[PDB]
Write a protein that binds this ligand. Structure first.
Ligand SMILES: *C/C=C1/C(Cc2[nH]c(Cc3[nH]c(CC4=NC(=O)C(CC)=C4C)c(C)c3CCC(=O)O)c(CCC(=O)O)c2C)=NC(=O)[C@H]1C
Ligand SMILES: *C/C=C1/C(Cc2[nH]c(Cc3[nH]c(CC4=NC(=O)C(CC)=C4C)c(C)c3CCC(=O)O)c(CCC(=O)O)c2C)=NC(=O)[C@H]1C
Lengths: 482, 482
C-alpha cells in the first residue's frame, strides 16, 4: 500500500544543508537562477543582487579558469579564500547547477585509502565465511572517515531488512541482527538509489537552508535536487534521528548487478563532514563488497552443488544394478531426502504412494495430490508457508511447511513431494514492528518512534528457503524417472 | 628437471640492481656482516670497511631515527642527502636486510592509482567481454608505469602460453594475438613467482654490482635474494632482451585461486625506475582483476549449467510422452547431439547401435567398445587426440577426433557416445619453436633465439576441448536413461 510515508517526494523540497552553495545558470551566456539563501558568506555580494546576472559577475577568476575542466571532468578543486571547497557540477531542468562544499585537508586519502582497500580485497577475502567480508567493509568505512558505529542493513523479499555487521567504540549502544521495518527506507528512496548512491547528513541538528526563488520559474515546482551533492534529507527523518542518538548518518547503498542489497549505515554522536573525495572513495569500497559477494555465491553454488550431484550419481547406479524401485529406493532413501535437506517424500508411481522418511499420514497425502493437479505449475510448486496455500496440513506443520511438486507426466497426477518441516527462529525487532511511525490524530502529518529496543516476534510455521539447487537437484530426479 | 634452464640458482647468484642497495645485518646487537659494494654512494665511507660495526654506527642519524618504525611496519621515508631513498625489508636467511632504493618524486602516484582502480572495477565491468577486462589492466598498469609496452600472458594447459592482450603507443612492434613457449619463465620461476608476484629489470644492459663476501660467511652459497626487490637475475635472461629492443622491466604474477594464470609484462625501449609504493599499486591491481574475473568464470558456468538443464528439461518430456527410445531419440537426436556440443551421438543400449548424426561406420563404433572394456574409467573417457591414444580410428579428421564415454550399466559393455571432429586452428608461432635457445658447441652455456618473427603451425586433427559444463551434462543423461 503506498502510504503518506511513500507518496511523500524527496528531490523537490526546499534545498541544501547549511554548508554548500548552489549558484544556478539558465541557457547560453551563463546567467544565475536558483541560488541558496546562504550564498552571501562564501561569495562576497548578496544573492538577490546577482539572481538575474551572469557568471562573469558572480564567481572569481579561479573557478572561471576552472569552468572549462569542470564541464570537462566532473568536479575540480579551487582554493578560493574561505578554504578549498569542491566543484562537482551536473545538468538539471535547464541549468548547469555548480555547487561547492568543503574539501579534504589531509593528503592521506590516497595513502589510508590504499591500505584500507587491501583489507577488503586480499590474497583470498573469503576465509572464515561471509560475516567477515561484511565485517571488514563495515570496519574499514568506520576506520576510513572515523565513526562510532556502522553496519550493513540488507533488504529482503518484502523490502524489510536487518544489520549483518557492527563496528563500534568503548561502550555506546548499537543494533545487530535486530530487524526493523520496511516503511523506513521506503519505495521512493531505493527507486532513487538505483541512480544516486550515497547521502550526507552534515549536521542533522541544524536546519535546512532554502532555495531562491522556491520554484525554478519555467517548470513550476522547485529544482531537481536529486543528483544534488548536498540534498538535506527530510523532516520525517532527522524528527527521527534526534531519537536514535545520531548527529549524522553516512550511507553508501550497494548493488553489484543492478539490484539494491544493503547500505552500510555510519552513525556519529556529533556533527561531522567527511568530504566528496572520501564519500566517493568509500562508494569505491561499497563497490568492492557488492563484487566479492557476486563472486562467492556465484561460486558456493558451483562448489556446493557438486555435493548435490554426487547424491544423484549414487542414486542412479544403485538404480541400475538390481533394477527394483522400492528395494533400491529404501537403501538410497537417506540420499533422496538429503538431496534437499528434507525429512519426508511421497512418490505416486501409479499404484499407492510410497511415503518414505518422516512424513505425515497417507489419508492426508491423497487430498494433497488432487489439490496440486488443480493448481498451475508447469512442472514444480514449492512454498515455505504451507498452511497458507493448502490449510489441511497447517495444524500438522512439524513436517509440512515446504514442499516440491515435480509433475512426472502430463495428465498423470503421478509425481513425488518432499515434506520439509518447522523451525523455531525467535527473531529480534527494534520496537514493536506492528506500528513503525506516529500518527498525529488526523493521520495526515506523522512522526517516527523513539522506540528502537528489542521487541521479539516469532516466525514459525514457515521453513527454510528453497535456494536454486533443491529446485534444480530435485528436477534431476523427475527427469531420472520419465 | 631438464635442460640447464631449470637449474640456474636464480636467488644465490650474488648481484643486485645498481640504483638500489641491499646490505645485511647479522646477530643480536644489530651488527653488520654483508654490504652490497656501491653502499658508499649512500654512506660516503666504503663498504669494505664496516662489516664489523654495529647497525647505527654504519648508517646515518637520519636513518637511525627511523630504524624504529621499520621494525614495526618495515617501510620508511628516511630522506637523506642524495635524493631520499626508502628501504623495505624482510629477514632472508637468519639475518635482516635493509634495501635502500629511490622515492616517488610525484604525490599523485597514489591519487592516480586509485582512479585506474575505478576504471577496472566500475560496476559494469565486462560488458564488452573478459577480453575487454584484460585490455583495460593493459592500459591502466601502463599509465601507472609509463612503460612503452604491456602484455598479459595466460599459460594454457601445457605451461606453454599465448599473449591474449597487449597495449602499445604508436610505431611500437607488438604481439597482439602472437604466441610462444614456457621454457623461458621456466619451472624455477613459476615456483618462485607463486611466492612473490613482481620483478623489475630497469637498466637491462647495466651489469650487476657484487655484494661481498661473495658467499655468506657461515653458510656458503650467496646470501639468498629470493624475496628482495633491487636484485638482478639469471644473467642470460636480460640476455634475450638485448635480442628485442627493451631496456627495462616490470612483470607481475596474476594469481587466480593460487595457480599461476600468468603475468603482465611492461618493458620499455630504454631504462625507467618505478617505486615500491608504485609497484605495490599494480601488484594491488592484479589481486583485484583476479577477484573480478574469478566471478566471471563462476558466472558463465552457472549461466551455462542452468542453460543445459532447461535443454534437458525439454529432452525428458519427449521421454515421458511415450514411444520407445529409438523414436524419442529420433528428433531429440537433434537435441542430444547438442547436449555435449558434439557433432553426433551413438547409443549402443544393448543391441546393434544407433549411429544418429555425422558418425563413422557401424563397424568402427563396435571396434571401440571392444577396446573400451580393456582400459580404465568408471563412468567416462573424454579425450581429444582420440587418434594418438588409439591410432586405428585415428584418421577421422572429419567425423570424430574426440569421444565421450558413459556406462549405462556398471560392469557391462554398454556405453553411449558423442564423437566430434578435427578443427584446423592457425597458430602464429612468434620465433622458431625448434629453438628455445641455441647453445655453444659444448651444450654447457645457452643464449636465446635472436629472432621473434611469425611462424605458422596449422594443427590438423584434434577436438574443440571438453568444457566442464558439457562434460557435466553426462552423469545426468546416464541417470535419466535405464
Ligand atoms: C514513511 C516515511 C518515512 C521516512 C522517510 C524517509 N526514510 C528514510 C530512510 C532511512 N531510515 C533509516 C533507519 C536506519 N537506522 C540505522 O541504524 C539503519 C541501518 C542500520 C537504518 C536504515 C535509514 C538509515 C534510512 C536511509 C539511510 C540514510 O540515513 O541515509 C529516508 C532517506 C532520506 C533520503 O531522502 O535519502 C527518507 C526520506 N522516515 C520514517 O520513519 C517514515 C515515517
Ligand atoms: C634455458 C634457460 C632459460 C631461462 C632461464 C630463466 N629466464 C627467466 C626469466 C623470465 N622469462 C620470462 C618470460 C617472458 N615474459 C615476457 O614478457 C616475455 C616476452 C613478451 C617473455 C618471453 C619472464 C617474465 C621472466 C622473469 C623476468 C622477465 O621475464 O621479465 C628466469 C626467471 C627470471 C629471473 O631470473 O628472475 C629463468 C630462471 N629463460 C629462457 O628463456 C631460457 C633461455
Amino acid at each position: 500500500d503506498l502510504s503518506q510515508c511513500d507518496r511523500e517526494p524527496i528531490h523537490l523540497l526546499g534545498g541544501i544543508q547549511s554548508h554548500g552553495v548552489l549558484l544556478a545558470f539558465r541557457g547560453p551566456d551563463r546567467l544565475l537562477e536558483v541560488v541558496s539563501a546562504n550564498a552571501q558568506a562564501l561569495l562576497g555580494r548578496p544573492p538577490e543582487t546577482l539572481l538575474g546576472q551572469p557568471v562573469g559577475r558572480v564567481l572569481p577568476a579561479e573557478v572561471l579558469a576552472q569552468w572549462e575542466p569542470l564541464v570537462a571532468r566532473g568536479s575540480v578543486r579551487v582554493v578560493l579564500p574561505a578554504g578549498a571547497y569542491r566543484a562537482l557540477l551536473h545538468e538539471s531542468d535547464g541549468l548547469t547547477v555548480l555547487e561547492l562544499e568543503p574539501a579534504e585537508l589531509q593528503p592521506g586519502m590516497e595513502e589510508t585509502a590504499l591500505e584500507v582497500v587491501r583489507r577488503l580485497v586480499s590474497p583470498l577475502a573469503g576465509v572464515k565465511g561471509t560475516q567477515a567480508l561484511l565485517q571488514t567493509a563495515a570496519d574499514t568505512v568506520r576506520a576510513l572517515t572515523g565513526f562510532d558505529r556502522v553496519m550493513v542493513y540488507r533488504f529482503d523479499a518484502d523490502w524489510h531488512g536487518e544489520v549483518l555487521a557492527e563496528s563500534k567504540r568503548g561502550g555506546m549502544d548499537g543494533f545487530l541482527g535486530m530487524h526493523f521495518p520496511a516503511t523506513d527506507i521506503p519505495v521512493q528512496a531505493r527507486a532513487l538509489y538505483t541512480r544516486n548512491p550515497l547521502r550526507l547528513i552534515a549536521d542533522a541538528r541544524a536546519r535546512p537552508v532554502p532555495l531562491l526563488p522556491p520554484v525554478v520559474p519555467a517548470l513550476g515546482r522547485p529544482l531537481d535536487l536529486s543528483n544534488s551533492a548536498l540534498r538535506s534529507v527530510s523532516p520525517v527523518h532527522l524528527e527521527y534521528l534526534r531519537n536514535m542518538g545520531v548527529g549524522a548518518s553516512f550511507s553508501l547503498s550497494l548493488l553489484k548487478e543492478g539490484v539494491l542489497w544493503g547500505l552500510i549505515a555510519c552513525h556519529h554522536l556529533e556533527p561531522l563532514h567527511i568530504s566528496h573525495e572520501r564519500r566517493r572513495a568509500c562508494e569505491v569500497l561499497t563497490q568492492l563488497l557488492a563484487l566479492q559477494l557476486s563472486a562467492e555465491e556465484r561460486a558456493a553454488e558451483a562448489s556446493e552443488d557438486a555435493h548435490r550431484a554426487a547424491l544423484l550419481g549414487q542414486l542412479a547406479t544403485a538404480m541400475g544394478e538390481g533394477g527394483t524401485l522400492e528395494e533400491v529406493l529404501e537403501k538410497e532413501s537417506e540420499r533422496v531426502l538429503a538431496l534437499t535437506g528434507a525429512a519426508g517424500v511421497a512418490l505416486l508411481l501409479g499404484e499407492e504412494p510410497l511415503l518414505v522418511g518422516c512424513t505425515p499420514a497417507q489419508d492426508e497425502v491423497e487430498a494433497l495430490v488432487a489439490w496440486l493437479a488443480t493448481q498451475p505449475f508447469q512442472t514444480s510448486f514449492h512454498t515455505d508457508r504451507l498452511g497458507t496455500v493448502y490449510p489441511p496440513l497447517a495444524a500438522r506443520a512439524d513436517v509440512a511447511a515446504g514442499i516440491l511438486a515435480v509433475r512426472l507426466a502430463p495428465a498423470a497426477a503421478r509425481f513425488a513431494i518432499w515434506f520439509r518441516p518447522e523451525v523455531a527462529r525467535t527473531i529480534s525487532w527494534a520496537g514493536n514492528p506492528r506500528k513503525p511511525a506516529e500518527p498525529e490524530p488526523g493521520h495526515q502529518r506523522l512522526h517516527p518512534r523513539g522506540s528502537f529496543q528489542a521487541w521479539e516476534e516469532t516466525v514459525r510455521d514457515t521453513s527454510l528457503p528453497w535456494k536454486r539447487a533443491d529446485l534444480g537437484a530435485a528436477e534431476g530426479f523427475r527427469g531420472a524417472l520419465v
